[PDB]
Every structure is written in structure tokens, then in C-alpha cells.
Amino acid sequence: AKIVLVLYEKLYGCTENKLGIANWLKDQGHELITTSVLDQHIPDADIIITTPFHPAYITKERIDKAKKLKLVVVAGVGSDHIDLDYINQTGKKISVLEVTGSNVVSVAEHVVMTMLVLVRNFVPAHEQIINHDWEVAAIAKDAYDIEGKTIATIGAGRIGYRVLERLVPFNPKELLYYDYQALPKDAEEKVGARRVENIEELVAQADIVTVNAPLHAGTKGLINKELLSKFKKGAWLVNTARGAICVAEDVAAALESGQLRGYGGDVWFPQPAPKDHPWRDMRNKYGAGNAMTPHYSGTTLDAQTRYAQGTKNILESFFTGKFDYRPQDIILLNGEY
Amino acid sequence: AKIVLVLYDAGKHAADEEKLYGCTENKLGIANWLKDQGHELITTSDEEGGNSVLDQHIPDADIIITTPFHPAYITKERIDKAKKLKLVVVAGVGSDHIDLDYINQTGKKISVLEVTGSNVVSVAEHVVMTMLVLVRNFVPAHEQIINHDWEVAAIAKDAYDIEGKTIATIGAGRIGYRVLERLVPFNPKELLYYDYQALPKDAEEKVGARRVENIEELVAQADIVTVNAPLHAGTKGLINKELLSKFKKGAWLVNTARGAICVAEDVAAALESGQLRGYGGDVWFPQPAPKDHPWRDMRNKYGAGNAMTPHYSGTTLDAQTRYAQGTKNILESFFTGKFDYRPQDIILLNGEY
Numbered sequence: 001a002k003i004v005l006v007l008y009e010k011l012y013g014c015t016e017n018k019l020g021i022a023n024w025l026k027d028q029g030h031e032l033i034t035t036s037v038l039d040q041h042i043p044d045a046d047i048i049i050t051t052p053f054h055p056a057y058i059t060k061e062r063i064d065k066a067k068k069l070k071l072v073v074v075a076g077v078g079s080d081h082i083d084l085d086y087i088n089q090t091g092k093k094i095s096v097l098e099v100t101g102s103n104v105v106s107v108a109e110h111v112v113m114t115m116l117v118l119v120r121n122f123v124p125a126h127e128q129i130i131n132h133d134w135e136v137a138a139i140a141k142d143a144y145d146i147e148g149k150t151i152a153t154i155g156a157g158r159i160g161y162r163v164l165e166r167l168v169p170f171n172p173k174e175l176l177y178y179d180y181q182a183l184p185k186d187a188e189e190k191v192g193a194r195r196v197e198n199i200e201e202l203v204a205q206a207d208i209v210t211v212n213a214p215l216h217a218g219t220k221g222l223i224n225k226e227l228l229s230k231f232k233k234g235a236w237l238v239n240t241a242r243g244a245i246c247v248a249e250d251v252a253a254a255l256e257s258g259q260l261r262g263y264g265g266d267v268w269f270p271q272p273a274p275k276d277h278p279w280r281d282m283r284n285k286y287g288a289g290n291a292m293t294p295h296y297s298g299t300t301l302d303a304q305t306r307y308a309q310g311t312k313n314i315l316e317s318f319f320t321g322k323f324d325y326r327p328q329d330i331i332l333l334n335g336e337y
Numbered sequence: 338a339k340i341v342l343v344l345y346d347a348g349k350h351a352a353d354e355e356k357l358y359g360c361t362e363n364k365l366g367i368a369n370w371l372k373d374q375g376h377e378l379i380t381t382s383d384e385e386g387g388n389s390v391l392d393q394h395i396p397d398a399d400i401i402i403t404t405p406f407h408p409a410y411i412t413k414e415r416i417d418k419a420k421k422l423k424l425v426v427v428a429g430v431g432s433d434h435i436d437l438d439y440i441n442q443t444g445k446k447i448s449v450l451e452v453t454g455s456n457v458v459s460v461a462e463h464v465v466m467t468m469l470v471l472v473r474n475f476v477p478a479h480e481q482i483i484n485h486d487w488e489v490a491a492i493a494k495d496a497y498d499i500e501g502k503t504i505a506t507i508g509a510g511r512i513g514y515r516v517l518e519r520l521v522p523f524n525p526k527e528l529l530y531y532d533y534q535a536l537p538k539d540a541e542e543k544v545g546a547r548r549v550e551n552i553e554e555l556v557a558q559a560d561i562v563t564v565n566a567p568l569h570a571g572t573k574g575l576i577n578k579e580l581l582s583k584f585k586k587g588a589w590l591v592n593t594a595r596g597a598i599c600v601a602e603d604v605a606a607a608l609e610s611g612q613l614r615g616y617g618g619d620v621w622f623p624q625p626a627p628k629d630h631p632w633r634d635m636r637n638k639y640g641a642g643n644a645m646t647p648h649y650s651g652t653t654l655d656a657q658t659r660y661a662q663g664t665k666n667i668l669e670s671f672f673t674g675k676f677d678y679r680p681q682d683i684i685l686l687n688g689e690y
Contacts, residue, residue: 116466125646137347293478
């Protein structure tokens with residue numbers, strides 16, 4: 001097989017380290033093309049490996065030109081950059097696989113981290129120290145405990161549920177969720193969560209809201225002026241799902257107005273964020289309430305180790321012709337959903 | 338009765354937030370209550386040194402109320418002058434600014450009360466937050482954003498999950514234990530503790546904790562170390578060059594206990610050299626921290642690994658509400674002559690432990 005790897009020492013998901021699989025592949029007798037050129041090699045690539053952290057767009061055109069293409073692998077989780085409906089439509093026997101579950105703990109941790117950072121007002125506290133100041137009242141006047149807060153998640157899938165699990169020992173007043181399906185009843189009692197049936201009702205009673213839902217027509221621009229006006233005044237909002245779920249200027253406006261006390265997360269639209277993106281400079285009235293990071297929560301070194309191993313497991317299932325894939329990793333199995 | 342209340346001035350910040358009870362402007366929310374009861378409340382931030390408002394009122398104060406976040410040093414010399422003193426209250430937890438020893442050894446009839454339990458959840462949250470910020474490399478990541486940069490690889494190269502890490506606490510009291518409880522669902526490899534007494538086995542198992550009998554073998558195996566112990570002869574300068582050398586290489590260290598438990602320059606050294614990947618916490622010595630305290634500018638090889646804050650973890654608005662209420666409850670027990678204090682609040686009761 002000819003394999004095209006698109007990226008950008010426990011680092012793996014960069015074009016210098018090659019998922020740590022460069023030798024794993026050559027000593028199996030394969031040719032590895034690693035790039036950050038790709039269009040040169042698509043006509044004869046049997047396999048294309050991508051990363052959601054520097055996504056190569058597997059467009060309609062590229063699919064067309066890929067006459068040998070049998071397999072696209074996402075070394076991580078997220079297929080937004082692959083034209084899956086087109087592959088499906090073509091009738092071509094192209095499998096698309098991802099390392100389902102490899103990102104979830106990492107992002108769930110990031111969410112809880114961000115909540116604590118916003119709630120406890122960590123950002124301006126640390127900024128005082130490094131700027132050689134000390135004024136405790138300036139920090140404490142907007143520092144709260146996460147204990148006693150009502151916390152709501154929009155989406156209770158793999159990431160959202162793991163968020164709830166990590167919140168349980170923090171003694172929130174209550175954990176709430178909105179989703180398109182019920183959590184299995186045992187799973188629900190294990191975190192003490194209560195399902196709320198509509199989004200407006202959910203956000204109205206929440207001190208902290210976290211967005212853990214797929215981007216689709218239903219969630220695109222979901223967090224807009226109108227919805228934000230139904231949040232508790234002074235709520236904290238975290239989003240590590242997708243940038244496009246929020247209306248960027250609407251969020252910034254709600255933070256400046258005090259509708260939100262804080263906003264944080266590591267997802268942006270457009271991404272990578274323009275130098276001028278409103279979420280870089282937005283602050284609450286106290287000059288804080290911003291816990292934005294670049295999109296990295298799922299590229300910790302521990303995550304990368306899981307992506308590397310998972311990519312090998314997928315490749316081995318393909319090379320052997322066993323196709324003994326994990327049901328959960330399959331996005332398309334020979335063009336089929 | 339005359340009550341002297343020593344707190345910080347919050348200035349502009351006390352106007353911003355009604356719930357900031359622990360400042361001179363807001364007076365623990367008890368000023369009108371005391372007034373309606375006919376007591377005289379002197380509220381001050383001026384605690385040093387001799388001509389101070391505190392020292393002016395000491396000779397006839399019946400009650401002195403203090404805060405760990407701006408501690409009035411209730412020294413032997415002040416105790417001797419305080420001819421009317423019957424009660425010292427800590428509006429919070431922490432009594433190292435008060436000469437308990439002298440009161441107890443003399444047998445002077447002075448009670449010393451604190452609001453036990455009111456601080457613990459706040460500090461425990463702060464420790465877990467600080468663990469996450471360090472391990473996940475949050476500080477330099479947030480810095481990229483506000484600086485108008487975007488370079489994921491520069492962050493990801495020193496970013497880990499907390500899952501699968503070995504995490505050890507030095508001290509398993511009220512705070513150390515609540516840290517362990519909050520770490521359980523993060524799936525660490527193992528939770529460990531060092532302490533001078535064992536946790537009961539039910540408490541140990543609730544959190545999957547294993548006792549390690551000495552600090553050297555505790556830190557030797559821990560990816561993350563958190564210090565949750567009182568300052569005494571066993572802990573003063575505990576975290577020094579020698580002990581640091583025994584830490585797992587690239588460890589993260591969190592201290593929300595007392596600054597003097599660490600040797601400051603030793604921690605800075607271990608961070609620069611890579612013995613520690615990160616250090617964070619809200620405690621300093623001296624305190625407040627001088628503008629040139631080494632923990633301000635210290636960083637790891639990548640210019641990060643610093644999650645220090647000023648000393649505030651126990652003074653969130655939620656904690657202040659509990660301090661203010663607990664203080665009022667103590668004063669009520671005193672004023673009524675019931676002396677129905679919560680047993681856990683009593684440090685000394687008329688000079689006796």
C-alpha cells in the first residue's frame with residue numbers, strides 16, 4: 001500500500017514525528033508519504049491518514065482523483081473535513097475510520113478545567129502575580145466556588161457524560177442535561193443528572209452551561225443573541241464542541257454586557273482564529289471572564305498516544321484484509337454508513 | 338461590648354460586589370446587627386504597628402475579630418494590654434497569627450474560635466483547578482490567544498491529561514481528603530497519601546488511596562504532588578533542594594497550604610532545571626509576596642509551568658458568605674451567654690484546649 005500522511009517525541013501528530021508509525025509501516029513493507037504535494041500522491045494512494053488538528057480537506061475533487069483510494073483514517077476524532085456524503089454517493093468502496101473515544105477524556109478534562117478557571121477567576125489572579133501586583137479584593141470580588149452551582153450540558157454523549165462524571169464530587173447544586181436521547185437510566189442516576197426537555201428552559205436555570213454537542217443544522221448558531229438573553233445573568237459558558245455553535249459577536253456582546261460572567265473553550269469559527277477574532281479581546285466589565293485557548297484540548301501527549309495506537313489498530317485491520325474494525329470507529333464501511 | 342474588627346480595605350472593589358463581606362467596607366455583614374444590639378464596632382485595616390487603630394482599641398476590646406487574609410497578629414504583648422479581652426474570632430480558618438501557646442500557658446480566660454470547615458471546599462477546588470491548569474498547559478495556551486497568536490504545537494508539546502497520572506498528597510486532613518475525592522472520577526493511575534496518622538480504611542477505600550509511610554518514597558513515584566499540611570517542625574522547609582531531587586523527574590507540584598513548607602529558591606531552581614514541569618498554588622512566604630519574590634518570574638524551559646496566584650483560594654464569595662455567617666453564629670453564642678459554640682470551632686475555650 002501507498003500511504004499518504006497529512007499532519008502539521010511523545011508528540012506524534014506532527015509531520016516530523018509521523019504518528020510514531022514511520023518505521024512500523026516501512027518494516028511492514030509500505031511506502032509512507034508524509035506531508036503538511038498531497039495532490040501529487042492522491043491518484044495512487046491506497047490509504048490517506050488525516051488529523052482533525054490540521055485537517056486536509058478530502059474534497060469531492062480529491063475523491064474523484066483518488067483512483068486507488070480504499071481507506072481514509074482520522075488519527076483522532078472528527079471528520080468535518082471529509083466529504084462523507086460524496087463518498088457515500090459515489091458507490092466507491094472507501095472506508096472512513098476514526099479513533100472513536102480517544103479524545104473524550106482529554107476534552108472532558110478541558111471542560112472542567114475551564115469551568116473552574118472561569119468560576120474561580122483564575123486568569124486575572126495569575127495575571128496579577130506575573131505583573132508584580134497583589135490586590136486580593138480585585139480577584140475575590142468575582143471568584144466563586146463551583147460547589148453549589150447548577151451546571152447544565154448541551155449534549156450528554158461521550159464527552160458531555162464524562163464532564164458530568166467529573167463534576168459529581170464537586171457537589172454542584174444539580175447537574176442537568178439536554179440531548180436528543182435519554183441517558184440510559186443507570187448512567188443518569190450515577191451522576192444524579194436530570195434531563196431538561198428544551199434548551200431555553202435548560203439555560204434559564206443554569207449557573208454554568210457547557211456545550212458538548214455535534215455541529216449540525218440544529219446546533220449551528222444555536223448560541224445567539226436571543227438564546228443568550230435567556231441565560232441567567234452572570235452565567236459562565238464553556239464550549240469545546242464547535243465554534244459555529246455560537247454566534248461569535250453575540251457571545252462577545254453578552255460577556256461585555258454582563259449577560260455572561262465568563263466564556264471559555266478551545267473551539268473557534270473560523271478556525272484557526274484570525275488575529276482579529278472578537279473572542280481574543282473580549283472581556284467582562286472587570287477585564288476578565290475570558291478562558292479561551294487555541295484548539296488543543298484533544299492533542300495532549302496522552303491523547304496522541306491513543307491516536308497513534310488506534311491508527312495502527314485500524315491499519316492492521318485493513319492490511320490483513322480482516323477488516324475487524326471496532327464498530328465505534330467506523331464512519332463509512334466501504335462507502336456505507 | 339466593644340468589638341474590634343480587622344479586615345483589608347477593598348476600596349473600589351467593595352462597591353462593585355455586595356457579597357464581598359470580608360472587607361472593612363462591608364464589615365462581615367454584621368455592622369447593623371451589632372448596632373441593633375447596642376455593641377460598639379471598631380472596624381479597621383490598620384494593624385501595624387504601635388500607634389495603629391488596632392492598638393488604640395485593644396485595651397478595652399471585649400472581642401477581636403481577625404481574618405487570615407489580612408491577619409492581625411495577636412501577640413503576647415497585645416494580649417497583655419487587652420485587659421478586657423474575652424474572645425478572639427477568626428472569620429475563617431487559620432490561627433497562626435494568634436499566640437495560642439501564650440494564652441494556654443498563662444491560663445488567661447480568653448476563648449479563640451474559628452469557622453471550621455468553611456474554607457476547605459474552596460481550597461480543594463483550587464488545588465484541582467491548579468493541577469489541571471499545570472498538567473494541561475493552560476497558562477501559555479491562554480497567553481497565545483490574548484497575544485493574537487496561534488501555535489498549537491507549542492502548547493501540545495507540554496500538555497498531558499490528568500487521567501493515568503500518579504497523584505500524591507502530603508497531608509490527608511480536611512482539605513487533602515476533599516482533593517482526593519474530587520480526583521477520583523478523573524481516573525488517575527493511583528491516589529496516594531503521606532500523613533502522620535492513617536486515614537481510616539473506609540475513607541482510604543472510598544477514594545482508592547494507598548498510604549506511603551515516608552515522603553521520599555511518596556514523591557519518588559508521583560507525577561503530581563499536592564501539599565495539604567499545616568506548617569510545623571515536620572513541614573517547615575520540607576520541600577527543599579534535597580527532597581526535590583527525589584521527585585519523579587518532570588513532576589508537577591501544587592501548594593495551597595503554607596508557603597514556608599517550601600524553600601522558595603529551591604522550588605524556582607527545580608522548575609528551571611526541569612526537575613519540576615510546573616508549580617502552582619496561592620501561598621507565599623513572605624506573605625504578601627514581595628514584588629521580587631522568585632515565584633513570580635520563575636518558569637520552566639518553555640516559559641510556562643507557573644500557575645501561581647495571590648492568596649485568595651479560601652476567600653471566594655461563597656467562602657466569605659460562610660465566614661460571615663459563622664462569625665455571626667459565634668458572636669451570638671457569646672452575647673447570649675449560651676456559649677453554645679460548635680465543638681469543631683473551638684480552638685481555646687477560656688484558655689483551655
